[PDB]
Design an enzyme around this catalytic site. Sequence first.
Site, short mmCIF file in Angstrom:
data_model
loop_
_atom_site.label_atom_id
_atom_site.label_comp_id
_atom_site.label_asym_id
_atom_site.label_seq_id
_atom_site.Cartn_x
_atom_site.Cartn_y
_atom_site.Cartn_z
N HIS A 64 2.34 -4.47 0.89
CA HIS A 64 2.38 -3.03 0.99
C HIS A 64 1.72 -2.60 2.30
O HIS A 64 0.72 -3.16 2.68
CB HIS A 64 1.65 -2.40 -0.19
CG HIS A 64 1.50 -0.91 -0.10
ND1 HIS A 64 2.57 -0.06 0.04
CD2 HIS A 64 0.40 -0.13 -0.23
CE1 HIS A 64 2.15 1.18 0.06
NE2 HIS A 64 0.84 1.17 -0.11
N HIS A 66 -0.06 0.27 3.56
CA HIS A 66 -0.69 1.33 2.79
C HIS A 66 -0.84 2.58 3.63
O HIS A 66 -1.53 2.58 4.65
CB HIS A 66 -2.04 0.85 2.27
CG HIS A 66 -2.76 1.87 1.44
ND1 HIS A 66 -3.18 1.62 0.15
CD2 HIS A 66 -3.16 3.13 1.74
CE1 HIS A 66 -3.81 2.69 -0.31
NE2 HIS A 66 -3.81 3.62 0.63
N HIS A 109 -1.74 -5.02 2.45
CA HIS A 109 -2.28 -5.91 1.42
C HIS A 109 -1.19 -6.37 0.49
O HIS A 109 -0.17 -5.71 0.34
CB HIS A 109 -3.41 -5.25 0.61
CG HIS A 109 -3.04 -3.94 -0.04
ND1 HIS A 109 -2.54 -3.85 -1.32
CD2 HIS A 109 -3.18 -2.66 0.39
CE1 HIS A 109 -2.37 -2.58 -1.65
NE2 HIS A 109 -2.76 -1.83 -0.62
N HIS A 111 0.77 -6.52 -2.68
CA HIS A 111 0.92 -5.62 -3.81
C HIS A 111 1.56 -6.37 -4.98
O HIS A 111 2.41 -5.83 -5.70
CB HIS A 111 1.72 -4.38 -3.41
CG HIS A 111 1.25 -3.13 -4.08
ND1 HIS A 111 1.29 -2.97 -5.45
CD2 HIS A 111 0.73 -1.98 -3.58
CE1 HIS A 111 0.82 -1.77 -5.76
NE2 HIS A 111 0.46 -1.15 -4.64
N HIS A 395 -12.29 6.19 -10.73
CA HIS A 395 -10.99 5.56 -10.48
C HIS A 395 -10.35 6.22 -9.26
O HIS A 395 -10.00 7.40 -9.30
CB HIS A 395 -10.09 5.76 -11.71
CG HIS A 395 -10.58 5.06 -12.94
ND1 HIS A 395 -10.51 3.69 -13.09
CD2 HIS A 395 -11.14 5.53 -14.08
CE1 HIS A 395 -11.00 3.35 -14.28
NE2 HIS A 395 -11.38 4.45 -14.90
N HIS A 398 -4.03 6.19 -5.98
CA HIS A 398 -3.20 6.17 -4.78
C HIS A 398 -1.76 6.57 -5.13
O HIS A 398 -1.17 6.03 -6.07
CB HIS A 398 -3.20 4.76 -4.17
CG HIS A 398 -2.28 4.56 -3.01
ND1 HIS A 398 -1.57 3.40 -2.81
CD2 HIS A 398 -1.98 5.37 -1.97
CE1 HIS A 398 -0.86 3.50 -1.71
NE2 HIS A 398 -1.08 4.69 -1.17
N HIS A 400 1.97 6.40 -3.53
CA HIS A 400 2.80 5.81 -2.47
C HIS A 400 3.78 6.86 -1.92
O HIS A 400 4.08 7.83 -2.61
CB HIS A 400 3.56 4.58 -3.00
CG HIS A 400 2.67 3.39 -3.27
ND1 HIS A 400 2.94 2.14 -2.77
CD2 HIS A 400 1.51 3.29 -3.96
CE1 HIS A 400 1.99 1.30 -3.17
NE2 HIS A 400 1.11 1.97 -3.88
N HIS A 452 -1.05 4.89 -8.90
CA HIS A 452 -1.87 3.95 -9.63
C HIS A 452 -3.33 3.94 -9.20
O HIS A 452 -3.68 4.32 -8.07
CB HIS A 452 -1.29 2.53 -9.47
CG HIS A 452 -1.35 2.00 -8.06
ND1 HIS A 452 -2.42 1.27 -7.59
CD2 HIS A 452 -0.47 2.09 -7.03
CE1 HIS A 452 -2.20 0.93 -6.33
NE2 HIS A 452 -1.03 1.42 -5.96
N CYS A 453 -4.18 3.48 -10.11
CA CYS A 453 -5.56 3.22 -9.73
C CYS A 453 -5.58 2.08 -8.74
O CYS A 453 -4.90 1.06 -8.94
CB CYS A 453 -6.42 2.86 -10.94
SG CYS A 453 -8.10 2.65 -10.41
N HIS A 454 -6.35 2.25 -7.66
CA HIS A 454 -6.38 1.23 -6.60
C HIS A 454 -7.50 0.21 -6.82
O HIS A 454 -7.77 -0.62 -5.95
CB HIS A 454 -6.45 1.87 -5.19
CG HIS A 454 -5.71 1.09 -4.14
ND1 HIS A 454 -6.09 -0.17 -3.76
CD2 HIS A 454 -4.62 1.40 -3.40
CE1 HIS A 454 -5.25 -0.62 -2.83
NE2 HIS A 454 -4.36 0.32 -2.58
N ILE A 455 -8.19 0.30 -7.96
CA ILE A 455 -9.04 -0.83 -8.38
C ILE A 455 -8.06 -1.86 -8.92
O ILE A 455 -7.40 -1.63 -9.94
CB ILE A 455 -10.12 -0.43 -9.40
CG1 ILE A 455 -11.18 0.45 -8.71
CG2 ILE A 455 -10.77 -1.70 -10.01
CD1 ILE A 455 -12.07 1.30 -9.70
N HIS A 458 -7.70 -2.93 -12.43
CA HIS A 458 -7.20 -1.88 -13.32
C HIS A 458 -5.67 -1.75 -13.21
O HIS A 458 -4.98 -1.61 -14.23
CB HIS A 458 -7.86 -0.53 -13.02
CG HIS A 458 -9.36 -0.53 -13.20
ND1 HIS A 458 -10.13 0.57 -12.90
CD2 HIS A 458 -10.21 -1.49 -13.64
CE1 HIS A 458 -11.40 0.30 -13.17
NE2 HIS A 458 -11.48 -0.95 -13.62
N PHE A 463 -2.75 0.24 -15.23
CA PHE A 463 -3.17 1.61 -14.88
C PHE A 463 -2.29 2.20 -13.78
O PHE A 463 -2.76 2.47 -12.68
CB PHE A 463 -4.64 1.64 -14.48
CG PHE A 463 -5.37 2.92 -14.85
CD1 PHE A 463 -4.84 3.81 -15.77
CD2 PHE A 463 -6.63 3.17 -14.33
CE1 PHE A 463 -5.53 4.96 -16.14
CE2 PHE A 463 -7.34 4.31 -14.68
CZ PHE A 463 -6.79 5.22 -15.58
#
Length: 499
Positions: A64, A66, A109, A111, A395, A398, A400, A452-455, A458, A463
């Site tokens: 991805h 980002h 990163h 994905h 949380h 993000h 896209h 989505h949560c970028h942790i 998660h 998530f």
Amino acid sequence: AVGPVADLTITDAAVSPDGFSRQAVVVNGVTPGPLVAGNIGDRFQLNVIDNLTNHTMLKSTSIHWHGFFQHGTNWADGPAFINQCPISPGHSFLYDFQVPDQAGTFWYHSHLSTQYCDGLRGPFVVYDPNDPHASRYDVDNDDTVITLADWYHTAAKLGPRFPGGADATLINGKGRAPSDSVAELSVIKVTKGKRYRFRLVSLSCNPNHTFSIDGHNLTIIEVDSVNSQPLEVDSIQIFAAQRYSFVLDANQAVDNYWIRANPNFGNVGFDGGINSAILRYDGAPAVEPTTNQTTSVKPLNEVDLHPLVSTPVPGSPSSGGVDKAINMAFNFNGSNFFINGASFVPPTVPVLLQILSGAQTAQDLLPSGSVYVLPSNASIEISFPATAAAPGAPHPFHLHGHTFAVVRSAGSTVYNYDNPIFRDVVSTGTPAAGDNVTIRFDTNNPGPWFLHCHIDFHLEGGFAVVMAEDTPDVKAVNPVPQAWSDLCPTYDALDPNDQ
Ligand SMILES: *[C@@H]1O[C@H](CO)[C@@H](O[C@@H]2O[C@H](CO)[C@@H](O[C@@H]3O[C@H](CO[C@H]4O[C@H](CO[C@H]5O[C@H](CO)[C@@H](O)[C@H](O)[C@@H]5O)[C@@H](O)[C@H](O[C@H]5O[C@H](CO)[C@@H](O)[C@H](O)[C@@H]5O)[C@@H]4O)[C@@H](O)[C@H](O[C@H]4O[C@H](CO)[C@@H](O)[C@H](O)[C@@H]4O)[C@@H]3O)[C@H](O)[C@H]2NC(C)=O)[C@H](O)[C@H]1NC(C)=O
Ligand SMILES: *[C@@H]1O[C@H](CO)[C@@H](O[C@@H]2O[C@H](CO)[C@@H](O[C@@H]3O[C@H](CO)[C@@H](O)[C@H](O)[C@@H]3O)[C@H](O)[C@H]2NC(C)=O)[C@H](O)[C@H]1NC(C)=O
Ligand SMILES: *[C@@H]1O[C@H](CO)[C@@H](O[C@@H]2O[C@H](CO)[C@@H](O)[C@H](O)[C@H]2NC(C)=O)[C@H](O)[C@H]1NC(C)=O
Ligand SMILES: *[C@@H]1O[C@H](CO)[C@@H](O)[C@H](O)[C@H]1NC(C)=O
Ligand SMILES: [Cu+2]
Ligand SMILES: [Cu+2]
Ligand SMILES: [Cu+2]
């Protein structure tokens, strides 16, 4: 820097960023991966060569980019099973996209699953030769990128499902863990009297970090690739995947000053020089700083950030004054996260491929209950009310394919319909504060976009949801290259152990 036309070769390799050797996923031999760079208007042709051999960290990959809108190149966005099948080991795949209308600090990163935690991540800068902030600084180059990363001694698939913190925070690829008090620290060099545009990128898989530099104040000029008015701060709480450019004036005494990146949990503090790097003025001795941290008296508050140029908030200045409002109700059952009663499970056919094959409605699209069809050219408001039902706060979410206005920030009860910052990753705050973080964007970018949560752990627990935007125009707007069409059959042909 590599790029805009470049090979990115992905392999497994031993690394020791904190003196502890472990196998990791690396890019062109290193993690974090090398800086990718170009200029606004550039076509990027990033040929991702998958030479991975280790199933435990995954032999397949997907990348991805980002923060990039990817207008008309939704197939290149990265999320596995949303925008493509993963690249298979022993194959290469060309990400080919343009960045006509953005400039700033980004990153790339994996994905796919939690693979970016195992090391597939690196910074990405798009320069503006006419940058409106250029007069605020003298130096802006490879050596003014500051990356922050959480680093684990146990691989992502081998540790706890939800780790309670990293073994080390890495700043520019190096940092200390308790297991090695003398591991090499990163040094960021500055020449006295020069002004530096530091591009601070969180490559974090989980914790957020409170960043500061002893004896220096910082002037924020960019937020997640959106030029801001200059905001002077003395510390920055940066969430996973966010970016800030800040100007540092190197006008203190020639010396060594501690750079600090304190995680919200894990090994907190600075004992033995953990969570630290070194700001070294030319001429200072090659030794550790002995400077002391002072209390932050001007910390960053997101509500204090505003766009540099007048940027209208979509819709009308009232709660729900948009074409479509969506609330995201969070749940968590110990292993899995849920949004509005659905935990995301990646489909067999990627969402984009489903749309290309005719599926245009929430009813036809998989997975069922996780896809939100959005109308074209419409104002969208999304609220993420913080709830105790969803542990692991704050949380950072993000979206896209878009930047969005942060109409209501974490730790604030104000709705700003006039001049709020726009960005692409936002903390959704905490239930203790009664947070109800709310964003707005316009739908001018046909395609399925992950939200989505970028942790990363998660995300892995489900998530996430998909914004399926202007589904009837997706095929026409996003012509796919033969190589993309080849991804799924090749991936689906793989032995499970080769994934
Ligand atoms: C595919 O990827 C996965 C995920 O990354 C990867 O999984 C690893 O799998 C192995 C085996 O299951 C796991 O191994 C455990 O590794 C533990 C950590 O080892 C580190 O520390 C070792 C000890 O360190 C000290 O001593 C040295 C010198 O004496 C000193 O320098 C240090 O400062 C310190 O004092 C160290 O030896 C080790 O280094 C080796 O491994 C790395 C990694 O490749 C390599 O780069 C080096 O060249 C070197 O070969 C490393 O730095 C280890 O403690 C643990 O051992 C105990 O537990 C077992 C339990 O069975 C006991 O039986 C055993 O007796 C020990 O007490 C065990 O070996 C490892 O943790 C996984 N990695 C991760 C990141 O999760 C796979 O290996 C990958 N596949 C391939 C083919 O590579
Ligand atoms: C970074 O920003 C902070 C906050 O704006 C600056 O702090 C301010 O710094 C000055 C010192 O230069 C402080 O005022 C002075 O206080 C001393 C001792 O109390 C007094 O003797 C002097 O006459 C003077 O008034 C001021 O209190 C402080 N403000 C705070 C802490 O809120 C700081 O100087 C900036 N740092 C750099 C390197 O520019
Ligand atoms: C967070 O903000 C959202 C959006 O304003 C709130 O949701 C709305 O709540 C009202 C009830 O007051 C409903 O009539 C609307 O249908 C809701 N909007 C939706 C579902 O899009 C939400 O209640 C707020 N949550 C908290 C905890 O304050
Ligand atoms: C949580 O829900 C998921 C998905 O519905 C289910 O597979 C899992 O067993 C549940 N986990 C726990 C710990 O109850
Ligand atoms: Cu990301
Ligand atoms: Cu989360
Ligand atoms: Cu994402």
